Amino acid sequence: XVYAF
Amino acid sequence: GHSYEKYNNWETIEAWTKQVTSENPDLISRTAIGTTFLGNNIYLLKVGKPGPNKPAIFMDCGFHAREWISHAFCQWFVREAVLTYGYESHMTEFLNKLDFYVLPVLNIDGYIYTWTKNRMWRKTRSTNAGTTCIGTDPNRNFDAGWCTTGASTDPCDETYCGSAAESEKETKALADFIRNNLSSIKAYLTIHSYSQMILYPYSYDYKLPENNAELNNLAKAAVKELATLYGTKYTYGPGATTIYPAAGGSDDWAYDQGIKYSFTFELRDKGRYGFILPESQIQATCEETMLAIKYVTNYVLGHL
Ligand SMILES: [Zn+2]
Secondary structure, eight states, X not given: OXXXX | OOOTTSOOOHHHHHHHHHHHHHHOTTTEEEXXXXXXXXXXXXXXXXXXXXXXXXXXXXXXXXXXXXXXXXXXXXXXXXXXXXXXXXXXXXXXXXXXXXXXXXXXXXXXXXXXXXXXXXTTOOSOOOOBTTBSOOOOOGGGOSXXXXXXXXXXXXXXXXXXXXXXXXXXXXXXXXXHHHHTTTXXXXXXXXXXXXXXXXXXXXSSSSOOOTTHHHHHHHXXXXXXXXXXXXXXXXXXXXXXHHTOOOTTOXXXXXXXXXXXXXXXXXXXOSSSSTTSOOGGGHHHHHHHHHHHHHHHHHHHHTTO
8 A cells, every 4th residue: 555556 | 423334433433343342242342452652442353153262363454544445344344244144154154163353443543643634644643753753654563574675764754664563552462462362363364455456475575485375376266256246356466576575564474473374455446546445335345355355264264
């Protein structure tokens, strides 16, 4: 959920 | 009031944990495993027909505050357990033979914050020495290749790994509970969004787990069952090569403790709505997710 992966 | 078809705030979820336990004392008991930085109770629901010396499957949701469909699913799973027990044979067998430890919201402080201030908050809400920047990424805070890759040493980043492994009360509480129940917990399942994936170790390094073949076939089977409902397509594999390197994750840590079946689930969608998944999709998302969860549970059950 890391932006933007 | 509470709805399984809507996103509920913390006050509502907390009251829910008490109510659903109270309504189903035969199937559910509640404790807390610790408190958060802001003193909220990290509830844990033990779902199952009580019995001596039962194996367990552990599931948490809400590591990351903004991933609301995560929190929703743990709530959905518990409703389904109590609804279908005695009426659907697999769930009846499941609750009869093992316990589910369901931790509906790990990162309560952050979750409250997405409701009150910042919908895109991810981290905890703990303070940091030397800066005004707030919070640690709880999924970079576990003692597994801690802060070596895929994380930041900067408190102002959303992948901040913390001042030390288990520096966060919430992650320490979760780690403490799993060690204190290691001999009964047979599977660890942590629910996130989004990306539609079922991942397993490792994330902190490119190395593969010794039962790599086993975990890949199980996730593969699980992804297949999940699709049977609506054709939703999930990918799968080792965290590091499947989505990206990320040290300090709870799934890797749990596995290195000896829990052989460890998975991170990234739910819907694939970016159209991202973290702000419309409430109309809650039901279908949870239903298909139930199938993957139940398939893994069955598998664990026949491999004790
Ligand atoms: Zn996440």
